[PDB]
Design an enzyme around this catalytic site. Structure first.
Site, PDB file in Angstrom:
ATOM      1  N   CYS C 152      36.043  32.763  38.537  1.00  0.00           N
ATOM      2  CA  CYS C 152      34.608  32.817  38.699  1.00  0.00           C
ATOM      3  C   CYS C 152      33.877  32.032  37.610  1.00  0.00           C
ATOM      4  O   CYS C 152      32.881  31.329  37.817  1.00  0.00           O
ATOM      5  CB  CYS C 152      34.078  34.260  38.721  1.00  0.00           C
ATOM      6  SG  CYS C 152      34.753  35.369  37.517  1.00  0.00           S
ATOM      7  N   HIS C 179      30.261  38.528  30.105  1.00  0.00           N
ATOM      8  CA  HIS C 179      30.862  38.815  31.397  1.00  0.00           C
ATOM      9  C   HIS C 179      30.865  40.316  31.645  1.00  0.00           C
ATOM     10  O   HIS C 179      31.247  41.094  30.764  1.00  0.00           O
ATOM     11  CB  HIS C 179      32.290  38.257  31.440  1.00  0.00           C
ATOM     12  CG  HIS C 179      32.847  38.107  32.819  1.00  0.00           C
ATOM     13  ND1 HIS C 179      33.180  39.185  33.609  1.00  0.00           N
ATOM     14  CD2 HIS C 179      33.142  37.002  33.545  1.00  0.00           C
ATOM     15  CE1 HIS C 179      33.650  38.751  34.766  1.00  0.00           C
ATOM     16  NE2 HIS C 179      33.638  37.430  34.752  1.00  0.00           N
TER      17      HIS C 179
HETATM   18  N1  LIG Z   1      36.393  40.676  40.058  1.00  0.00           N
HETATM   19  C1  LIG Z   1      35.935  39.466  39.773  1.00  0.00           C
HETATM   20  O1  LIG Z   1      34.813  39.273  39.310  1.00  0.00           O
HETATM   21  C2  LIG Z   1      36.822  38.281  40.072  1.00  0.00           C
HETATM   22  C3  LIG Z   1      36.263  37.014  40.202  1.00  0.00           C
HETATM   23  C4  LIG Z   1      37.057  35.944  40.539  1.00  0.00           C
HETATM   24  C5  LIG Z   1      38.408  36.132  40.723  1.00  0.00           C
HETATM   25  N2  LIG Z   1      38.984  37.348  40.564  1.00  0.00           N
HETATM   26  C6  LIG Z   1      40.463  37.484  40.739  1.00  0.00           C
HETATM   27  O2  LIG Z   1      40.717  38.102  41.998  1.00  0.00           O
HETATM   28  C7  LIG Z   1      41.898  38.933  41.912  1.00  0.00           C
HETATM   29  C8  LIG Z   1      41.511  40.333  42.320  1.00  0.00           C
HETATM   30  O3  LIG Z   1      40.441  40.784  41.456  1.00  0.00           O
HETATM   31  P1  LIG Z   1      39.613  42.096  41.839  1.00  0.00           P
HETATM   32  O4  LIG Z   1      38.516  42.290  40.846  1.00  0.00           O
HETATM   33  O5  LIG Z   1      39.251  42.044  43.288  1.00  0.00           O
HETATM   34  O6  LIG Z   1      40.723  43.234  41.644  1.00  0.00           O
HETATM   35  P2  LIG Z   1      40.805  44.713  42.254  1.00  0.00           P
HETATM   36  O7  LIG Z   1      41.734  45.523  41.410  1.00  0.00           O
HETATM   37  O8  LIG Z   1      39.410  45.200  42.463  1.00  0.00           O
HETATM   38  O9  LIG Z   1      41.486  44.448  43.677  1.00  0.00           O
HETATM   39  C9  LIG Z   1      42.896  44.141  43.754  1.00  0.00           C
HETATM   40  C10 LIG Z   1      43.434  44.748  45.024  1.00  0.00           C
HETATM   41  O10 LIG Z   1      44.819  44.359  45.201  1.00  0.00           O
HETATM   42  C11 LIG Z   1      45.476  45.418  45.849  1.00  0.00           C
HETATM   43  N3  LIG Z   1      46.912  45.244  45.674  1.00  0.00           N
HETATM   44  C12 LIG Z   1      47.648  45.588  44.568  1.00  0.00           C
HETATM   45  N4  LIG Z   1      48.923  45.317  44.688  1.00  0.00           N
HETATM   46  C13 LIG Z   1      49.039  44.762  45.955  1.00  0.00           C
HETATM   47  C14 LIG Z   1      50.145  44.269  46.675  1.00  0.00           C
HETATM   48  N5  LIG Z   1      51.388  44.257  46.202  1.00  0.00           N
HETATM   49  N6  LIG Z   1      49.914  43.784  47.918  1.00  0.00           N
HETATM   50  C15 LIG Z   1      48.661  43.797  48.388  1.00  0.00           C
HETATM   51  N7  LIG Z   1      47.549  44.237  47.805  1.00  0.00           N
HETATM   52  C16 LIG Z   1      47.805  44.713  46.575  1.00  0.00           C
HETATM   53  C17 LIG Z   1      44.909  46.651  45.157  1.00  0.00           C
HETATM   54  O11 LIG Z   1      45.175  47.862  45.831  1.00  0.00           O
HETATM   55  C18 LIG Z   1      43.421  46.285  45.092  1.00  0.00           C
HETATM   56  O12 LIG Z   1      42.734  46.710  46.262  1.00  0.00           O
HETATM   57  C19 LIG Z   1      42.405  38.775  40.471  1.00  0.00           C
HETATM   58  O13 LIG Z   1      43.331  37.700  40.398  1.00  0.00           O
HETATM   59  C20 LIG Z   1      41.111  38.424  39.730  1.00  0.00           C
HETATM   60  O14 LIG Z   1      41.321  37.821  38.463  1.00  0.00           O
HETATM   61  C21 LIG Z   1      38.198  38.439  40.242  1.00  0.00           C
HETATM   62  O1  LIG Z   2      38.729  32.080  33.730  1.00  0.00           O
HETATM   63  C1  LIG Z   2      39.127  33.240  33.507  1.00  0.00           C
HETATM   64  O2  LIG Z   2      40.248  33.546  33.055  1.00  0.00           O
HETATM   65  C2  LIG Z   2      38.157  34.390  33.808  1.00  0.00           C
HETATM   66  O3  LIG Z   2      37.158  34.014  34.744  1.00  0.00           O
HETATM   67  C3  LIG Z   2      37.475  34.899  32.542  1.00  0.00           C
HETATM   68  O4  LIG Z   2      36.549  33.916  32.076  1.00  0.00           O
HETATM   69  C4  LIG Z   2      36.732  36.216  32.745  1.00  0.00           C
HETATM   70  O5  LIG Z   2      37.369  36.951  33.785  1.00  0.00           O
HETATM   71  C5  LIG Z   2      36.690  37.072  31.477  1.00  0.00           C
HETATM   72  O6  LIG Z   2      35.384  37.017  30.902  1.00  0.00           O
HETATM   73  C6  LIG Z   2      37.724  36.649  30.453  1.00  0.00           C
HETATM   74  O7  LIG Z   2      38.314  37.778  29.815  1.00  0.00           O
END
Ligand SMILES: NC(=O)c1ccc[n+]([C@@H]2O[C@H](COP(=O)([O-])OP(=O)(O)OC[C@H]3O[C@@H](n4cnc5c(N)ncnc54)[C@H](O)[C@@H]3O)[C@@H](O)[C@H]2O)c1
Ligand SMILES: O=C(O)[C@H](O)[C@@H](O)[C@@H](O)[C@H](O)CO
Ligand SMILES: NC(=O)c1ccc[n+]([C@@H]2O[C@H](COP(=O)([O-])OP(=O)(O)OC[C@H]3O[C@@H](n4cnc5c(N)ncnc54)[C@H](O)[C@@H]3O)[C@@H](O)[C@H]2O)c1
Ligand SMILES: NC(=O)c1ccc[n+]([C@@H]2O[C@H](COP(=O)([O-])OP(=O)(O)OC[C@H]3O[C@@H](n4cnc5c(N)ncnc54)[C@H](O)[C@@H]3O)[C@@H](O)[C@H]2O)c1
Ligand SMILES: NC(=O)c1ccc[n+]([C@@H]2O[C@H](COP(=O)([O-])OP(=O)(O)OC[C@H]3O[C@@H](n4cnc5c(N)ncnc54)[C@H](O)[C@@H]3O)[C@@H](O)[C@H]2O)c1
Ligand SMILES: O=C(O)[C@H](O)[C@@H](O)[C@@H](O)[C@H](O)CO
Ligand SMILES: O=C(O)[C@H](O)[C@@H](O)[C@@H](O)[C@H](O)CO
Ligand SMILES: O=C(O)[C@H](O)[C@@H](O)[C@@H](O)[C@H](O)CO
Lengths: 338, 338, 338, 338
Positions: C152, C179
């Site tokens: 993000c 963040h």
């Molecule tokens: N939250 C953010 O702001 C954000 C932004 C950009 C990218 N991401 C990335 O997206 C990914 C998910 O982040 P999130 O915040 O949604 O996490 P989250 O924990 O809210 O969601 C993860 C989901 O994965 C599921 N899961 C776990 N193990 C699994 C498996 N083996 N098979 C299938 N599903 C499984 C969990 O039950 C959960 O619902 C991460 O890589 C994160 O870094 C997050």
């Molecule tokens: O690029 C990345 O690894 C993430 O987006 C990162 O910037 C944020 O998830 C967080 O603020 C870092 O701990």
């Protein structure tokens, strides 16, 4: 059908009353007064809201002290004294008194000298008659010039108490409202000499607080006079509150009968006022809910057929503001052709 | 007088039990087990605490899996199975079971095969006998090997309920605990399939929740069996909780008589367990309070001489952890020369 | 024009990708996998969102493991191993890998054995090619089966860095992202052995943290390789983050020229990706904003014509999820008739 | 050695100055003025603190407007006009001006007509000379009657900037302070016509804000005039802030040389003012820290030998209040026998 309304105090309640009024055709806001909020500043506070999101309509700064919201002109004033607000100049019939500092009849009546015909205090009053839509609005009479819409908490508890008392009788009840913090509280430990606990850091503390809301139900529902009281707990959320009503009934009643009675009222005479849910709700799910009271069936619990704990949510900003507008529309029809 | 103690689960309760134990001479911590916390990591989690501040003593990483805290050596383990922890190797007599995943007698008894003599589950148990210091510890017998210290909420409610019931009788009671969030909750909306509301954003929501604490008082106080139940509201604070007890008494009693009875117990048999205050307290003022229950005299309210709402605070981490240590010291004297 | 999509990991990103996909006609979600979320539970997590409010469409539990959302059937699975998900059974062409535990090419490619053709990792990858819509999506080739949509933060910084570098050149830049906390953090001090600070109470702390996002811009924009790095500060908000970019330019440039360049791009080639505002914004005002980067003109400041601090907001959930869908739609057209 | 001090404005800074003064023997508080805080109320606000815990000493309400704190009598006043405070009646030599509304020389000098000899404004001033202990207190002269202790942020940045500039030279620097909210902010969206963003809900928003602290370093360190500026981000924590300084040096320097220089100063001439840590700190770990600036070695990062980002914590209440007392003690020795 053209109800011209003015707002005194462009705060949380004043702006959310405004937002709900301009998005509908039942009421026209024509004037706003707030000495601490200039007109260009008022446009920004209306557009952006930390709790209820961005304003959906259109906003323009038309002249020095006018705004055009949805092709409608609204004049703004900065008068510290309500008697100096020229409500009658623009045909303001009903004034929403939402400053928090003119809650008595003697103070609120100052709007009448400015041309206003009726004043609706957006808070409890020491002497003005209080009304709760769905409970006692039919007791209003056209000879009443200054009235109160009670508090947000009373508007949550009274419709629920009416259902319970009408169906099973309330012998006695004790209420706790777990309540979001409000504009009267402090960001960090600060002076609140009238309420010492209320001065402590708002978003870091559970803060016990007094409330007259439960006793006020005995005024809107006279048969419950002296049978209810309670207290409040201010907690670190910015909006949405919940009533926790522990009461002893007069007749044996199961929790399922209570659920059915509330659900029945929510679909009948209290539709739009009292809601009913069985979902796994948390406070943010009720943000923006227009009801005064949303009964949470799965959160409550009964000890026995005479002793029960009932849980009902309320958006203390959004639902209460809609009731103000509902109250204005109701008494406008009574003052004319009922 | 040398009570050798081990801790399984170096979490909130495990570390705060540890902190209070090493700062006194009544109990010696000799071993700690936690598979998700290495020894060097354990030193950091002990030194710095977001809720209770920095550790006051001295910490050293002496060897691969040893810490020296206040000139005392503590061995650390990383065993997922409690039966693989060599408690008897270092003379561990009493084990604090604070993982949250071995709360049954059949699971907690695995510590006995490792050389431990008694296990104290830091939570309610489905079948192990529960004890609350100041209420029923005298019912303990030396033939009991696996025991429970109940929950933090039960340790707050039971001493208060004992005073009210002993003096005026509790005919019926309904309890709400406004409770800080804990390690079982989620920072943002996440999976909690056993408790749907409990998965929602912890610091942005009022979250209704179930609790057995009020029914558990009927087990530690048998005369109150079936006369109490209640629920919980998780709110956005990180520590300190408060019990809201609405009860009907058996005898007429004024609120001043209730205050005097609680204050009397707080200075007598329940000293150090039940506290009494008339100050304008908010939740942060009780952070670090060693009592199990701090009665808030000015926050409660009575409807009449038979129907009252009582408010009592508890630091759900600090007070409960001290009770664990108090319980260990008590049963250590009973198991030897009482 | 019928792009059949599957989602692995029904979390914050998975559900918000889902919500934005079903409310449009560019993409059809047909399958979801999450072993920790059953189908009836998935309906509740979709309906109620603490951050983005209630789902606007219609939800039905049609069979054992199917949901009907807006008259469209979606099958749900509970497979811990991605290779056991039968994507090809329902014609899933593109899979959103949003679990957080399959971010490498070798792990993410397990979806291909289940019938999927392309995998889009919703996170940075150690070896899969990363793309940022509006910066380098034209470098995608149809022979790429596993790809990353970066993070993000990278999606916020890269479009801004492209505008600054294209117009005035970035000689060097240092970035801080303030963040919101996320699902990887803890409600209270808990184990995070790979990131000690990241285990501390999320909503009570400013928490320094590492990030590769600024270095990753040097991969999506090769000319900036080695010219950017930075760090993160996790703070107690549940959603919305902001990038603080301090950079030295290659050419003299005033702050007004920077504003005009960003505004120009926001209305031209980066429309819908890079936004521009002069309003007095705070973080909640950007909740639900679909852009990847919203430049805050009045929040930044310049020291001189070569040294500037630039501020850009991003809803780390909503904007990023829309980019995933934008990326899927883009490569779907390339894989067919471009 | 008997420095008699008075405090005007018994707020966050006034009470924390008081708390640190009465717990030591270098300074005697004899008088306090605050029209919005009565004497009995002042005792409660001193005893209970949401941020820094309970007062450790002894407090008694001795007469109508006197408190006995640690066997020392303190007289309290409720004067809105500083000229009406009889400082000279009790021998007050030095007055801490911590109201926030008398920051100019012309306003602060009103304390002199009441018998006070020196006034120390607990904030930046438009015209009074500003001092930062450890940076320029030796530039003070006994002919100066009204002085400023600058802001908390300047007291964090200036000692760090002095070390960097003295050792490696600062060619240019841009600063962000991630800052806890304060008493000037609002619990919910409220009027702040001089700072629109500053009126928005304090504990729900990241709030960009202006600050003169970085420019003020160019006044306390004249060689840095015009080489530093910056901005602030108010975030939902109640106390503790952190400076993020991105600067270009004049000489090539590694990050390890920066760490060593700061650590050296922290053990030498800046001992007690500038701290140095390599631990995995989060904001709550610095609550109660007496230093003005705690350099966080592991949180910062360097792009190259000329471009670095430096992180330093400060308890914006506790450290700044100790500097006020340190400044009073310093100028008291200069005004007498230096
Ligand atoms: N939250 C953010 O702001 C954000 C932004 C950009 C990218 N991401 C990335 O997206 C990914 C998910 O982040 P999130 O915040 O949604 O996490 P989250 O924990 O809210 O969601 C993860 C989901 O994965 C599921 N899961 C776990 N193990 C699994 C498996 N083996 N098979 C299938 N599903 C499984 C969990 O039950 C959960 O619902 C991460 O890589 C994160 O870094 C997050
Ligand atoms: O690029 C990345 O690894 C993430 O987006 C990162 O910037 C944020 O998830 C967080 O603020 C870092 O701990
Ligand atoms: N906030 C709630 O949840 C809630 C719910 C129900 C009722 N109420 C009641 O509504 C009233 C307002 O509450 P609020 O939360 O909106 O407060 P607020 O502080 O957010 O708004 C009050 C407004 O009044 C304005 N004002 C102050 N003095 C004025 C004057 N002399 N003339 C005109 N305007 C003036 C202020 O500038 C401010 O905009 C109070 O009586 C409150 O108890 C509040
Ligand atoms: N937190 C409170 O306020 C509170 C109060 C009273 C009782 N309790 C009870 O205490 C228990 C622990 O609560 P907490 O808040 O400290 O939880 P926590 O999550 O903070 O700590 C639990 C610890 O157990 C460790 N652990 C996990 N699996 C383990 C295993 N197999 N072997 C050894 N250690 C293991 C974890 O790594 C963690 O350090 C629960 O039963 C809880 O209900 C909690
Ligand atoms: N809070 C911080 O972190 C911090 C740090 C450094 C400096 N400061 C500066 O210190 C000053 C006070 O800040 P604060 O956070 O303590 O504010 P505060 O609002 O917590 O305290 C201000 C106090 O001044 C009192 N007061 C108001 N008008 C008065 C008058 N006419 N006469 C006497 N007393 C009066 C108020 O009743 C209140 O107790 C401001 O200039 C602020 O910028 C604050
Ligand atoms: O009725 C009233 O006075 C209010 O509605 C009251 O219940 C709440 O505003 C608050 O929780 C009490 O401090
Ligand atoms: O007794 C118990 O189970 C617990 O102590 C319980 O009361 C609290 O942990 C929580 O508020 C319930 O969800
Ligand atoms: O120097 C100053 O003015 C202040 O210290 C300032 O830096 C902080 O109070 C705040 O973060 C700015 O809004």
């Amino acid at each position: 059908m053209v109800v011209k309304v003015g707002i005194n105090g462009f705060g949380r309640i004043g702006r959310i009353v405004f937002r709900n009024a301009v998005e509908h055709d039942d009421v026209e806001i024509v004037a706003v007064n707030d000495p601490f909020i200039e007109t260009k500043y008022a446009a920004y506070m209306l557009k952006y809201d930390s709790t209820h999101g961005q304003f959906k309509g259109d906003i323009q700064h038309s002249s020095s002290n006018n705004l055009t919201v949805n092709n409608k002109t609204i004049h703004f004033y900065q008068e510290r004294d309500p008697a100096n607000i020229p409500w009658g100049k623009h045909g303001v019939d009903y004034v929403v008194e939402s400053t928090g500092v003119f809650t008595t009849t003697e103070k609120a009546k100052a709007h009448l000298s400015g041309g206003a015909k009726k004043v609706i205090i957006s808070a409890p009053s020491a002497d003005a008659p209080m009304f709760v839509m769905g409970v006692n609005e039919k007791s209003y009479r056209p000879d009443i010039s200054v009235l109160s819409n009670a508090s947000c908490t009373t508007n949550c508890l009274a419709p629920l108490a009416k259902v319970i008392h009408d169906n099973f009788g309330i012998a006695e009840g004790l209420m706790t409202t777990i309540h979001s913090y409000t504009a009267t509280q402090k960001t960090v430990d600060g002076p609140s000499h009238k309420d010492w606990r209320g001065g402590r850091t708002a978003a870091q503390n559970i803060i016990p607080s007094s409330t007259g809301a439960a006793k006020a139900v005995g005024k809107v529902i006279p048969a419950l006079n002296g049978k209810l009281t309670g207290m409040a707990m201010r907690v670190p959320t910015a909006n949405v509150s919940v009533v926790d009503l522990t009461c002893r009934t007069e007749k044996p009643v199961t929790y399922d009968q209570i659920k059915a009675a509330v659900k029945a009222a929510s679909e009948g005479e209290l539709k739009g006022i009292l809601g009913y849910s069985e979902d796994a709700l948390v406070s943010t799910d009720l943000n923006g809910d227009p009801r005064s009271s949303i009964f949470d069936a799965s959160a409550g619990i009964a000890l026995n057929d005479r002793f029960v704990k009932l849980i009902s949510w309320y958006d203390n900003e959004w639902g209460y503001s809609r009731r103000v507008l509902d109250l204005i529309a109701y008494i406008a029809k009574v003052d004319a052709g009922k």
